[PDB]
């Protein structure tokens, strides 16, 4: 059996340094480090973290006066981070940059009291921080994430409007949504094309091309990563069955049974480490030497604050 990986596949630039900053501190002042959410959406660096003394919580009310508290890298809303400021904490922000720049533009919007759409996935802690930059009562702030959504929505004064989006999203779902958008509303202001980062569109884009070859794609990435969750989408609607699994412990042998060629891929939160357990436990049952797929080159590193090193 063939395997192929896709490339580029793994760790972007923000989730690289989420973890960084979260460890380093750790490094600095010793367990525990709080961390509002899970620093990135995987199991294994979220476990690792853990038995490290990580302590993730959800709210701020969860975190004791004097301790250091990280944000996620999903990033927070102002209500979380004027809590936060509020209380006693040193606080160290693993915002993503490519997150915290669209958060400043729903800023600017909200300061505006100008609306604005944000194209997202309800319940996501990216859309909670994102929606939740925006307080103006005199504007408004809405989420859709589909064109039915569009085709409900009414708001104040469609010749003040502007979108946003999710980072992570189906760069073809989205490119959907904003049509639908400029068809509704045509004096909406927005990116050139969407807020979705580089890191997404690149193992989107590398994913069409490893489904092109392979008769089956694992990604690995955990339930609750956004954009390991479009890689696998992506992929069973090329017809191809399309499995999100953590570790290779979830690799079942019929997915692969008599399959000739399988692909591998990873979310923007998946160690290394994972995909390389993956592919020792694709070879246990009959791949051979791993391919990897000629891909569009990363080359952006985004460094820990200084505070951190
Ligand atoms: C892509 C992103 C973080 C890296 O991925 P994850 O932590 O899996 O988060 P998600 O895709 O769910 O937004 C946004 F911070
Ligand atoms: S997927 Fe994109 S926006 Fe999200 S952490 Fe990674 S580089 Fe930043």
Same mark, same amino acid.
Not at 215 to 227: A, F, I, T
């Given at each position: ?107 600017? +919007?909200? =300061?505006? *009291?100008?609306?604005?759409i /944000? %194209?997202?996935? !309800?319940?996501?802690?990216?859309? $909670? ?29 469609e010749?003040?409007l502007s979108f ?17 958008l400029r068809?509704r509303f045509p004096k909406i202001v927005g ?43 992506? +992929?069973? =609607?090329? *017809?191809?069955?399309?499995? /999100? %699994?953590?570790? !290779?412990?979830?690799?079942?042998? $019929? ?55």
């Open positions: 059996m063939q395997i192929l990986l896709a490339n580029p596949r793994g760790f972007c630039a923000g989730v690289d340094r989420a973890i960084s900053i979260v460890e380093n501190a750790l490094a600095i002042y010793g367990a525990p480090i709080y961390v509002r959410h899970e620093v990135v959406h995987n199991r294994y660096v979220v476990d690792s973290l853990r038995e490290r003394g990580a302590i993730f919580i959800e709210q701020i009310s969860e975190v004791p006066d004097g301790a250091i508290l990280i944000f996620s890298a999903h990033g927070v809303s102002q209500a979380v981070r004027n809590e936060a400021k509020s209380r006693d904490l040193t606080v160290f922000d693993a915002t993503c940059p490519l997150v915290t720049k669209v958060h400043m533009e729903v800023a600017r +919007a909200s =300061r505006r *009291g100008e609306e604005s /944000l %194209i997202g996935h !309800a319940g996501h802690p990216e859309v $909670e921080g994102t929606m939740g930059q925006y307080s103006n009562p005199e504007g408004g702030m809405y989420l859709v994430e589909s064109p039915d959504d569009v085709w409900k929505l009414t708001v104040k004064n010749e003040k946003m989006t999710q980072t992570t999203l189906s760069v073809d779902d989205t490119s959907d949504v904003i049509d639908a068809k990116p050139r094309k969407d807020d979705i980062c580089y890191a997404t569109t690149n193992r989107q884009e590398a994913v069409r091309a490893l489904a092109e070859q392979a008769e089956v794609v694992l990604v690995v990435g955990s339930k609750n990563s956004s954009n390991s969750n479009r890689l696998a989408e992506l +992929a069973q =609607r090329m *017809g191809k069955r399309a499995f /999100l %699994i953590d570790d !290779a412990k979830d690799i079942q042998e $019929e997915w692969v049974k008599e399959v000739k060629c399988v692909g591998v891929t990873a979310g923007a939160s998946a160690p290394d480490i994972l995909v390389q357990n993956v592919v020792a436990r694709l070879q246990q049952l009959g791949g051979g030497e791993a391919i990897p797929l000629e891909g569009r080159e990363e080359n952006i590193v985004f460094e820990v604050p200084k505070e951190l090193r």
